């Protein structure tokens, strides 16, 4: 139920500032935070329904009507012309202009040489190698700039769990660097708002919130969507957490990379600390700058890998096409590249009952168990829902029966997906134990994750899909290998054979294959005979009819008929239908001693 | 010789400021620009070898020793304590701290838009950070920077794959002819110049045709090397380039590097037809917008690749299943397949070849013309082309690569051909029709002023590496066709053989560790033996005859197997029941490419 909280409609503000909801129609204040009455000259009752111009004046920029896309005015100087001296400090206001509402949030200026001071840090990260180096540079650098007791770089993993990859802290305290946090700690709903509103601040934990006096819109009958307002009251859940932790102030800047939430810049203060708009703007700058390099280094990385992976793949393709006899040594020379293209620990090449095991891989019988399990009708759903190839990161999860084997085959890539059989390819990765330091799931916990291999890189997975061609290459080569063998065998027979292709009644019944013993009795050789109509009257009408009726229907016949001599030569014509997938005769076997 | 100039060691400074080289060992000035003597108070002779501290009055930040990675201190307030009221304008100094040397460059403050300019630039950075597509961001940056600093010209120069430039965006005075859309050669910006723009991201010329300030002790007095400015903004630019700008009428420069993915994507070129020094605060804002724009361009490039890459895969994967599912390739199968098959590679046409048959689709040359192209590629002359090729053979302009096939270009200017090996029977030809290019040059030292429009013919749109990998990823449709065809024929011959009367078996020759086993067995054969076909495949041949069979007769058969020769011997069969069944074993070697027997044909009759 907690992971289902609205959070964007709390109907409360952080007391450090004031919020006003204005009807753009008349320009009158429809809703207001309880803190408004004190800052502005007039108490609540009269302030409600009053025009905004009457109570607050702003010289820099003014609100305006918006058509569809909401527009946001940044923090500018705002004055309160309705009281005999109301500035116990300087005030600054920001707008959120919607087509049905105007949202003005105001807070003190403060400031205390900032954007120029941040420039050397930005420049220094914008050119440093690897994420690690940049993360730690940003951590230390922001700790110097904004001055928080803790500055940590929190990276989201694939299942949205966090990891503190970088940290800058006071000499005292215990480092949270290296700690793992669940996905449950930051709900989807919350994560969305960090992508929306990039810099989030908790000025003092355990603040006494300011409720928006008219809770719902008096004419729209809805609460205030505070999704863009910085004054948005945080979940009491999270507040209790921070309070239990001893941290009293919080600054969180979103590390958005390629329009995706990559991670967060988490800042904790064990005393209260309001970060003013000007400073928030600097942290946003460093977050974007860091966010930038991470994606730059990620790009250069992909680029490099992508090429070498192709160079290898392409060697594999030629080497396989060039060789006509798939030998043990062929597969032994091929094996390293075949493993390398996908960064596997082992590979097993299957060719119907035969297994060419290479690298660090389970025993032949164990490999058979894995294949037999995948090819199963139970896991039939798995292959369909799969994309080009079937792959696992922890065999024990996906195939609970195959829970063991994991020390050598924790992860695997399997090609082809169809239970096509004969030729297949099993790439394996051995179990790599993970030592993960939790937040407590008064001391530390180290989960020692077993039965999982290193995650299959999407780039390696596409490398795998790109090798499906080696499977049909084997199959094609194998059929062609067998075909010639059977063609050889047939031609060397004594009992005169020929295959007959049924003409779709448009074409006549023509010869497809003819053996040497057959083409001899006829006289003329094989190449002259391929593509010659079987209808080759002298021969009794009765006997021919029997043969013609078998062809007419797609049935069998056994009839003695005279041939063509270069004695006239009579033979017994043994026509027989060969099984068709459709069940409708398309070919016949003709033999006749 | 010009394309191999040092430029990083000119031994000269831009007169607008002063440069000093300091020995970090005991803080003395080892080298100095001729402009140093006038602003620092003390003339050259005594100023040389003197500690920086005597003329130091920098309160903000001080230099320091470094270890390995050089560090740079930003422009801060510096004062000259040797003269009574030394200037008329405030002076600012920046440091370049190297482990062997310290480089301090100083110049006037000026400002007239400082951090007020940094807040003023914030909504522009904000505006581009949100912008869709490069084209919109480029033009936003152009207009925005033209407003932020009053340059007469602001252009966004994009480097193409061959390091040639294109002015994709431009913001200018109402007057002066727009250079927007103009193409520049790679030769105009040399490799070493390009390298420095990746090194020093922001570079300005205050006034073209400045009287340079030489570094009085030309080489280091103790290290014996010249001063590598590289990071110093005061560095003197090539006279070559200065003459160019002068000929062009421009007097002031400001060039901010658009570095994307650690590579020089392009430049923000700013021209002023009068002189214009852009202050420390000034340069800093352009750097910001340069950082921001470069950011967004890469972001959009990533999201873009990501999107395309997926839809291509989705299509590719439909084609794979659709092709595997169909067992007899019909005209309608290929007609339904055709659009996706063209789309996966963004082709104008495609021709599917299945030995003498051609399924041509889209905008493609005639059947005979297609045959000419294939026959030419499959040629022994162009054998080198297919070897040097990667997964598939691809052309961007058929007339160049295949001079004989110079025509056909209106419909097949570019193509992708698969498979690479002259494997034949099955193939795939993707075509792209001629797209004429109209490229506006600067001129074709060179006066420019007059532009030339090159009208390139016989070329199709460049094959995207993403589309080329899409093509390579479809080689599987070729072996799929071939496999299907061989399997189709094999099954036919296997059918034919199994329905025979004479009683046939194929034998696979073993080794010293393996035995001679039956590969194929018909019914007529498996009947005489008794036990069925599936219960006989993989059976050792020695099994088939009785263990009572005369030593003499078996020997003859064993000799033939031992050597890989033929034999014809009557032998009793291994009768489960007890009825003596004898047959003439007609073993015969089947032709091998090597000529060394690998299989035998066994026929039975006696
Ligand atoms: C030696 C061959 C050269 C020829 C010919 C030529 O025209 N220039 C040559 C050399 C160098 N050019 C250098 C810098 C430079 N080049 C450009 C190019 C353009 N600027 C434009 O505005 C346009 C079109 C509108 C073009 C095609 C720019 C902008 C710059 C930087 C100076 C500036 O901002 O104008 C160069 C390096 C010089 C240096 O910094 O030392 C060399 C050697
Ligand atoms: C319900 C689920 C929640 C549990 C069990 C919990 O502890 N918090 C839950 C919900 C929310 N968390 C939110 C924000 C938030 N969590 C963290 C977590 C950490 N931050 C750290 O610095 C460390 C360790 C060093 C951990 C483990 C952070 C950083 C944030 C963001 C704010 C911050 O800086 O802490 C929210 C959103 C709150 C809101 O704005 O309403 C919810 C809900
Ligand atoms: Cl809203």
């Amino acid at each position: 139920v907690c992971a289902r909280e609205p959070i964007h409609i709390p109907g409360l503000i952080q007391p450090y500032g004031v919020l006003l909801v204005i009807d753009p129609a008349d320009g009158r204040i429809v809703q207001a935070s309880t803190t408004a009455a004190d800052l502005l000259g007039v108490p609540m009752a009269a302030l409600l329904g009053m025009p905004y111009t009457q109570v607050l004046t702003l010289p820099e920029a003014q609100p305006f009507a918006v058509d569809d896309q909401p527009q946001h005015l940044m923090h500018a100087e705002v004055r309160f012309p309705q009281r005999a001296t109301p500035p116990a400090s300087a005030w600054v206001a920001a707008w959120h202009l919607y087509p049905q509402q105007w949202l003005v949030e105001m807070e003190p200026r403060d400031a205390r040489v900032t954007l120029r001071e941040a420039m050397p840090l930005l420049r220094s990260v914008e050119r440093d190698p690897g994420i690690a180096e940049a993360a730690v540079r940003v951590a230390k650098g922001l700790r110097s700039l904004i001055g928080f007791d803790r500055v940590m770089i929190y990276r989201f993993d694939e299942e949205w769990n966090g990891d503190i990859i970088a940290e800058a802290r006071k000499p005292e305290l215990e480092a949270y660097l290296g700690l793992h946090y669940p996905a449950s700690d930051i709900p989807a709903q919350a994560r969305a708002l960090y992508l929306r509103n990039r810099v989030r601040q908790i000025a003092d934990v355990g603040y006494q919130p300011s409720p928006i006096q008219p809770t719902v819109h008096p004419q729209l009958g809805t609460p205030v969507d505070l999704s863009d307002v910085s004054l948005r009251s945080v979940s009491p859940v999270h507040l209790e957490y921070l309070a239990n932790m001893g941290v009293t102030a919080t600054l969180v800047a979103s590390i958005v990379v390629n329009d995706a939430l990559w991670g967060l810049i988490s800042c904790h203060h064990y005393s209260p600390h309001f970060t003013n708009h000007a400073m928030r703007d600097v942290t946003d700058a460093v977050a974007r700058t860091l966010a930038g390099r991470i994606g730059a280094l990620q790009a250069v990385a992909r680029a490099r890998l992508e090429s070498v992976l192709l160079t290898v793949r392409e060697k594999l393709i030629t080497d396989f096409n060039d060789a006509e006899h798939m030998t043990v040594e062929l597969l032994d020379d091929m094996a390293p590249d075949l493993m390398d293209v996908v960064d596997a620990d082992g590979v097993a090449i299957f060719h119907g009952n035969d297994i060419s095991r290479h690298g660090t891989t389970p025993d032949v019988a164990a490999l058979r168990r894995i294949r037999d399990h995948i090819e199963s009708e139970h896991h039939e759903a798995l292959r369909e829902d799969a994309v080009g190839a079937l792959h696992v990161d922890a065999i024990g999860e996906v195939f609970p029966e195959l829970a063991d084997l994991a020390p050598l085959a924790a992860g695997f890539i399997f090609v082809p997906l169809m239970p096509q059989s004969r030729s297949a390819l099993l790439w394996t990765r051995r179990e790599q134990i993970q030592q993960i330091k939790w937040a407590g799931n008064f001391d530390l916990w180290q989960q020692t994750v077993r039965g999982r291999a290193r995650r299959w890189s999407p780039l390696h997975l596409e490398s795998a899909r790109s090798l499906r061609v080696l499977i049909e290459l084997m199959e094609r080569k194998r059929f062609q290998q067998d075909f010639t063998l059977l063609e050889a065998s047939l031609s060397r027979l004594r009992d005169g054979v020929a295959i007959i292709e049924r003409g779709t009644a448009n074409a006549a019944h023509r010869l497809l294959f003819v053996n040497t013993a057959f083409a001899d009795v006829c006289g003329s050789d094989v190449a002259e005979l391929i593509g010659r109509e079987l209808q080759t009257s002298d021969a009794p009408r009765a006997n021919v009819e029997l043969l013609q009726d078998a062809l007419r229907n797609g049935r069998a016949a056994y009839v003695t008929l005279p041939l063509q001599v270069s004695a006239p030569v009579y033979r017994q014509f043994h026509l027989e239908p060969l099984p068709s997938p459709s069940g409708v005769t398309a070919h016949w076997l003709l033999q006749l001693r």
Side-chain angles (χ1 to χ4, degrees), chain A:
Chain A
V1 192
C2 159
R4 319 183 116 180
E5 279 175 30
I7 87 147
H8 64 258
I9 41 157
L12 306 129
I13 284 316
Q14 279 200 53
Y16 71 82
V18 164
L19 177 84
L20 302 165
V21 186
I22 295 142
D23 175 33
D26 58 12
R28 287 163 182 215
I29 305 143
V30 290
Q31 301 166 275
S33 58
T34 52
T35 173
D38 212 303
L39 172 75
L40 277 51
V42 50
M44 206 52 56
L47 178 56
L48 237 131
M50 198 195 276
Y52 97 97
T53 54
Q54 246 102 291
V55 76
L56 62 148
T57 50
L58 29 152
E60 287 185 44
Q62 305 59 46
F64 54 85
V66 128
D67 169 70
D68 176 64
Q69 262 348 91
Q71 291 196 76
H72 312 279
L73 297 161
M74 284 193 80
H75 279 277
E77 187 216 19
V78 64
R79 292 195 256 254
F80 311 98
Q82 265 298 331
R83 223 269 164 171
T85 197
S89 34
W91 279 63
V92 81
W95 293 81
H96 305 285
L97 314 170
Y98 302 113
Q100 300 231 286
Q101 280 140 268
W102 291 348
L103 258 55
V104 56
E105 57 165 309
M106 46 224 102
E107 58 165 60
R109 265 197 184 274
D110 172 38
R112 82 147 152 280
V113 73
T114 40
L115 259 134
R116 264 268 302 193
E117 236 108 289
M119 210 81 192
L121 180 265
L122 298 338
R123 297 178 177 180
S124 295
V125 342
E126 161 215 47
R127 39 232 216 90
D128 68 3
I131 290 156
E133 297 79 346
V136 60
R137 175 170 256 97
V138 159
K140 291 184 199 186
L142 202 49
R143 209 226 173 274
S144 78
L145 291 160
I146 209 30
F148 258 77
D149 308 312
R150 197 154 241 136
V151 181
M152 41 211 159
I153 280 93
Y154 187 106
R155 191 216 226 277
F156 289 108
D157 77 5
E158 290 71 46
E159 283 87 12
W160 288 101
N161 305 286
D163 302 292
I164 295 179
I165 66 164
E167 200 195 24
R169 65 207 203 79
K170 232 196 177 179
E172 43 202 64
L173 304 148
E174 67 280 274
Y176 305 141
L177 181 112
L179 270 51
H180 181 96
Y181 301 92
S184 67
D185 271 4
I186 304 157
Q189 149 81 260
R191 258 178 283 132
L193 258 87
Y194 292 86
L195 237 160
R196 242 254 238 208
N197 169 20
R198 248 84 139 159
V199 187
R200 218 280 256 103
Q201 161 207 221
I202 301 169
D204 153 63
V205 169
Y207 55 86
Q208 212 268 73
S210 311
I212 307 161
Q213 197 78 117
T215 336
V216 278
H217 196 109
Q219 320 263 259
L220 264 111
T222 45
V224 210
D225 176 40
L226 267 17
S227 295
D228 292 325
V229 198
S230 72
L231 299 176
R232 188 189 49 80
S233 281
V234 280
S235 184
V237 176
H238 176 57
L239 272 151
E240 244 290 310
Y241 172 179
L242 293 172
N244 290 322
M245 229 61 158
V247 1
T248 301
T250 255
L251 192 65
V252 260
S254 305
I255 312 163
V256 175
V257 174
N258 302 335
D259 297 329
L261 196 67
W262 183 90
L264 311 173
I265 299 177
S266 215
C267 308
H268 288 13
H269 217 60
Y270 293 86
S271 59
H273 179 24
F274 159 89
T275 304
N276 99 293
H277 79 294
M279 287 282 199
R280 258 135 52 182
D281 286 343
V282 160
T283 91
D284 179 39
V286 327
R288 297 190 182 264
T289 299
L290 169 68
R293 260 251 115 158
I294 98 93
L297 298 148
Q298 286 192 334
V300 184
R302 177 186 186 83
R304 228 171 213 112
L305 216 192
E306 222 157 42
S307 76
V308 321
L309 224 56
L310 169 72
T311 310
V312 179
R313 257 207 320 281
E314 285 316 317
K315 181 167 170 299
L316 247 167
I317 300 315
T318 68
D319 290 7
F320 244 87
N321 228 321
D322 293 3
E324 227 50 49
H325 299 21
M326 43 194 291
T327 58
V328 58
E329 61 127 40
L330 170 268
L331 286 186
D332 276 304
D333 314 323
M334 227 100 304
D337 296 293
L338 197 62
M339 269 178 265
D340 267 17
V341 284
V342 129
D343 190 33
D345 292 308
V347 70
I349 322 117
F350 296 82
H351 208 293
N353 301 310
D354 288 79
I355 307 170
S356 200
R357 198 238 265 88
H358 311 275
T360 328
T361 349
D363 66 274
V364 178
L367 295 156
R368 267 154 192 165
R369 221 222 295 171
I370 300 174
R371 191 188 187 177
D372 172 82
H373 237 264
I374 298 164
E375 230 108 51
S376 157
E377 286 187 292
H378 295 264
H379 298 288
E380 191 114 32
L382 250 162
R383 286 106 54 90
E384 321 302 335
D385 313 344
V387 61
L390 188 83
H391 78 105
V392 298
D393 281 315
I395 183 154
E397 281 161 22
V398 203
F399 296 76
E401 190 285 304
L402 294 167
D404 53 311
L405 316 105
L408 290 204
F412 65 66
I413 295 179
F414 189 71
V415 165
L417 275 176
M418 218 224 95
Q420 260 170 282
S421 317
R422 188 126 120 277
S423 301
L425 261 174
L426 187 75
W427 282 277
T428 79
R429 266 196 201 150
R430 46 210 231 89
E431 174 207 65
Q432 168 226 64
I433 61 93
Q434 279 140 55
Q435 216 76 208
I436 44 157
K437 323 194 116 178
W438 291 80
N441 201 191
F442 256 162
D443 63 68
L444 172 69
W445 290 97
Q446 276 185 54
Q447 194 190 287
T448 319
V449 212
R450 283 194 108 220
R452 316 198 71 120
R454 336 180 244 114
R455 262 181 129 94
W456 289 105
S457 164
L459 217 255
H460 282 121
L461 275 155
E462 234 312 299
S463 205
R465 288 180 210 112
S466 290
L467 280 183
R468 280 172 288 173
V469 71
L470 292 182
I471 258 74
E472 300 300 88
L473 202 116
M474 283 187 277
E475 281 303 289
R476 170 200 82 80
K477 246 131 164 68
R478 179 67 215 268
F479 281 117
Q480 170 191 58
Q481 197 256 118
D482 287 337
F483 162 78
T484 65
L485 232 175
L486 250 50
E487 180 200 39
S489 308
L490 284 192
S491 265
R492 309 215 49 264
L493 280 166
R494 76 101 142 155
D495 244 40
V497 196
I499 311 320
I500 276 92
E501 195 155 83
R502 154 241 66 203
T504 30
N506 45 63
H509 304 292
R510 223 156 229 187
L511 302 169
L512 225 186
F513 165 86
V514 53
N515 105 297
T516 286
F518 191 107
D520 270 353
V521 190
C522 289
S524 167
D525 68 83
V526 285
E528 281 177 312
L529 253 62
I530 295 153
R532 281 239 168 275
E533 315 183 1
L534 170 67
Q535 287 84 340
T536 307
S537 315
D538 182 294
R541 205 253 208 106
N543 291 69
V544 187
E545 202 95 59
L546 284 136
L547 171 64
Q548 298 284 14
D549 278 295
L551 299 168
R552 214 170 276 152
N553 296 292
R555 305 180 288 112
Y558 186 97
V559 159
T560 318
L561 285 150
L563 285 124
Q564 288 68 31
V565 73
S566 193
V569 183
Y570 310 85
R571 267 314 186 266
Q572 3 263 286
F573 276 70
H574 195 121
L575 192 97
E576 220 139 55
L578 302 164
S580 174
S582 72
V584 199
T585 311
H587 305 273
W588 289 278
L589 162 84
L590 185 78
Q591 36 158 344
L592 17 53
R593 228 321 276 195

